[model samples]
Target chain A: SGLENIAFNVVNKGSFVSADGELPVAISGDKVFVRDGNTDNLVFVNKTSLPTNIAFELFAKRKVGLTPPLSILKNLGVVATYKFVLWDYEAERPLTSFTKSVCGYTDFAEDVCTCYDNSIQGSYERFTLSTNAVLFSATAVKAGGKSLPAIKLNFGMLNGNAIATVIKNINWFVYVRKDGKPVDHYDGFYTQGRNLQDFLPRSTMEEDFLNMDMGVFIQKYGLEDFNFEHVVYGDVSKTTLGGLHLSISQVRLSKMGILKAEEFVAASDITLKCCTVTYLNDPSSKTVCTYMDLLLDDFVSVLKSLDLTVVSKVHEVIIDNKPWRWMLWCKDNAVATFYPQ
Target chain B: SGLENIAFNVVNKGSFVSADGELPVAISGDKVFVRDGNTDNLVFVNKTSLPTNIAFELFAKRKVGLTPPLSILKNLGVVATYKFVLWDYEAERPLTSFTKSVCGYTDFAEDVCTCYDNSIQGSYERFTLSTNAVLFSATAVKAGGKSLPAIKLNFGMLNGNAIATVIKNINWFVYVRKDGKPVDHYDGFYTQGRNLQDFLPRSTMEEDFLNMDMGVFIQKYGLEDFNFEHVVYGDVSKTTLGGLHLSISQVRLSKMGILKAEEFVAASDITLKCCTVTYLNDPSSKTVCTYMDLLLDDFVSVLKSLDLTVVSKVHEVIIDNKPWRWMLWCVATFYPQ
Candidate 1:
């Protein structure tokens, strides 16, 4: 018989965030720091003060593993749970995080876990740890007391352990707002969901009365209300220990303002903490106070000699702790928070 | 988007046999044994001399490893070289092996051990090692003189290794007529081959120029082969060495075979020498006196019971050992010097 051949394709996906008070931005730097935030939105510092008129876009690639901490919802004070849409950039589709509002437990419980069925919603987007999403021109909106800058962007997220585990089979794409509008109709998109029941099958029911546990009856009918030969069982007061559970809730979206471009440029010089890091491999440990301050002493000396529209300055230095240490940014402030590590 | 599903199938081909000998015949209480012959064919024996017809068929099944020595080859040998067409049995079609053959090679010295090029006439047929073939039958064939009451069939060549080291991917079917007419045909099967060139690609062209003494060459080629006026002048032969070279060959294919049905049923009654092999595994180093005698006894027994309609018996068992050991049957010697 003649020989046979087989083939396939691969893709990547994830999310990115701007600094706490800054608009998400894109930059041309090699490495940017970011922090994981208590909120659902990942945040990174934006060093650039580009104008907000330009279109705003955000890009990220990552593989979704364990659900994000549920504590984020209670902190946000969102009573009504919302679903998250994971954008798969390669597939060019939205991946729904859940089929319905996941609630009723601190962590996901039996019924609650199944309640957030992904099959009915869609498969969560998948992405390689090294993937990057590029935002062409995303503008920052005015909100609260800040003016956000418009910027282009790209970012990636990776689960360190996931890399050495199973063979990677999914790739994803995440497209943020093309225009910095809070309620744009085309802003939301999602992908298909997976069937949870298929992954976990059910067992048969028992019918023998003698085989039934007497402990269940004793618990259901309290000692005070129990009667040995009662035809109908009286009201039962029952209590049981909690079982393993998981829950996902509290999703909210909001528009924020961009910083004024001139305000950043007007500063005669900027100050930044430069520090050397050792043993970065120890995730649980960190060195403190080992920072140095940098001043633009030669700023005017170099700016006056060059012909450019903006006289931006950058400190080619490394620091142990920066707000946007783990994020990508075009403007300063796109930061993600990482705590307890 | 919704989820999608994927599916495929597997298949098995048929089998055929060699016509070099009469259909094996057997009777109750017959003995059978298989031997390595120059031309691959199964020989059967019937010590009890009862009349029986051997009916055989080939089958494809999932198996762990190569078939044991003396295992039967069903339906002659048509399925010899080809892969079993995977049929869903349930779906009754072809199925896939779910794997692709990858080509690679290991290098040794000036010769590059390669898979024989099929384009070359003498190249060995590529034989797959991981596939399986099976044969089955219930009734045994009737035996007469010149026509065996029963025959023993052995699959695979007994190399000097004593163990069947390399199995030939290509096989042929043979059928022998009662009048001593024998017909042969190719089995049309191929196997995956691994080439050794891939692992070693170093050039050997400049070895002699760097390692050999060049002073002797100055006298042979004269000064014309060199530029004596220049500091680098030297005979052309002094700095020249043979160009890169590589050699390739294949493991011979006639070494592998399948057992016939007649041999399978009568195998238990055969008195095999059962020699206690010791020390080395090389076939050339081992003794075959007891084994060869046992084989000869079984061969003569089958010849004495061949059906008159199919074959005759009592011919001398001709033994030749130039290229390899071979046995020839003859009815008369008057035609030869």
Candidate 2:
């Protein structure tokens, strides 16, 4: 059941944490109910793809008393799930289900947050106030007096090395430590909320990863010294399938004068996955080409020169006891911009 | 009650205000108070030799009629007052009395709003959807169905040079308009949230002033003259008492680049205060105190070595017709942090 509803919310939210607490890898939501076939993939609880029998065991237990909250998430439930999972690479996969009022289901694959890169550079005035659901694992409700207090602040976790780096197609590829790469809209790291003194790159297409001047890119990684003290952080799992497949785990630096070191192993968890290919029917074409830049394998051949192509961003969210720091593990977005191709 | 319940919420919620327009500066409440003041100390206002003198001026003139709106400040009545006026640099003493919750009663302060720093370096990610209490003189509330218009963004005035720079110890002194020293927590001076690009240093001995090296702090603050083209801000008043004696007015930069001639004196005032020093009671005996560079001030000097010693931040607050943003005279804080 989508890695058993993400190992029942990481075994009821103990949220497997480890880095410098003796870093072991492989992944575990208390050992994900020890594997077998359709364990599908909570970061490889064995493996699968053959089955889609899709029977949501008679609505799990079919109990519902009342709940409805999307109010305006870009004009709600405009779906296309004949398996065409479009959650938006710039949207476009609708001709049929006439806007799936309740996101027309295929038992909505679960997974919502663990996004660690793409769209990184922050501001509180130029603005990004911890953008994208302001850093999920989220909750906010205030009204205290005599000098404030009564804030909830909920957040999220569970990456299993971003589901084995989006299942190995090393996916979007970019690396650094001595060599690895990838990845603010404020969301955390601060003075006004921090992120390493950020070296100015909000344009000229993120200017060569914030001025990559290590005497010009270690001559393509023979490595001598490369610096990027901040930005490039990831985590997205119970991994993907709403058009599924996307993974992250980041932080890489080299300057002897350096910095997140829990590594003598997993040398900078190098990941960059972006797999979810076809879903573009009639997807009109006008092509304005507001000048673009691509190297992550020409990002879907520049999204088939676009007006809405294959975004298949798999979607799903249903919360009750207040869960949604990152939807089960991935596709439910109020704002999560990852366009750093 | 306090000042006749702030003049019965100022003769029924008017929230007093006046300055070029007859602004009075004890404070007001459309909100913002937003202008300024820690009012740590205001030089002095007719000595009392630290006396709670516990005076509400003979009943002041009891009055209590219609109105009880505390409307979701998350429900109020939280206090603690035992201030014997202790403002540190060397706690000059005022003794007697212990903690008094309900803030020892002379009345508390009010007003809150107006804060917009981010957009720091600018996609302006579509603004914090319209920011906190949303820029408050205060009001905004939308059930908005058939129509729209139920917002009350109140504000205030009466600054008198921010009421004499909070009242002169020139307060928390730290500056850099060309060169004025002592500052902490980068506030205002920006394309974003001020701190020229501040490389981490509000202590660890403020690490090389947070790693300063921008071509040598821009050739000792001159680099072919730099200038801020827009957004000049101001406000200060509502003083305090402690080791007490402070006053503030800010934003002063120079190497000539002159502006602020006066749209109304104190062009968004130039301020940069940084006051807080402690080394009393067994303040560790070590000399060469060698090259110290680790700062949140030695994690608050190992939290003042430990059991908070001799402290008296005589805090009192009162707000009728609601006025805080910077309490009229000062000394009161619960969540001011």
User: DockQ scores for all the models shown?
Assistant: 0.00, 0.00
In terms of docking quality, model 1 is: incorrect
* Model 2 regions more than 4 Å off: A1-295, A298-300, A303-341, B1-337
User: What tens-digit string does per-residue lDDT give for candidate 1 at A1-341?
Assistant: 00000000011122322112332222223222222243223222211111111101211222234222111111112222123322232222112222222211212222221111122233222111102211111123344678433221111213321111123323222122222222122211111111111111111111111133434643443321222111111111111101000000000000011100001001101112111111101101011111111111221122223222222323222211122121111122211111111
* Tens digit of per-residue lDDT, candidate 2, span A32-57: 23233445333222111111111111
What are the per-residue Cα lDDT tens digits for candidate 1 across B1-337?
0000000000101112111222222121221211111101112222222221111111112111122222112222212222222122211111221211210111122311122112223322222111222221122222333432222223221110011111222121222222122222322221111111111111131122223334543343232332222112111132221111111110100012111111112221112222221222121111221222112123323335433342323333231101112222232111000
Proportion of true contacts reproduced by candidate 1: 0.00
- Single out the weakest 10-residue window by summed lDDT for candidate 1 chain B: B1-10
User: How good is model 1 by TM-score?
Assistant: 0.17
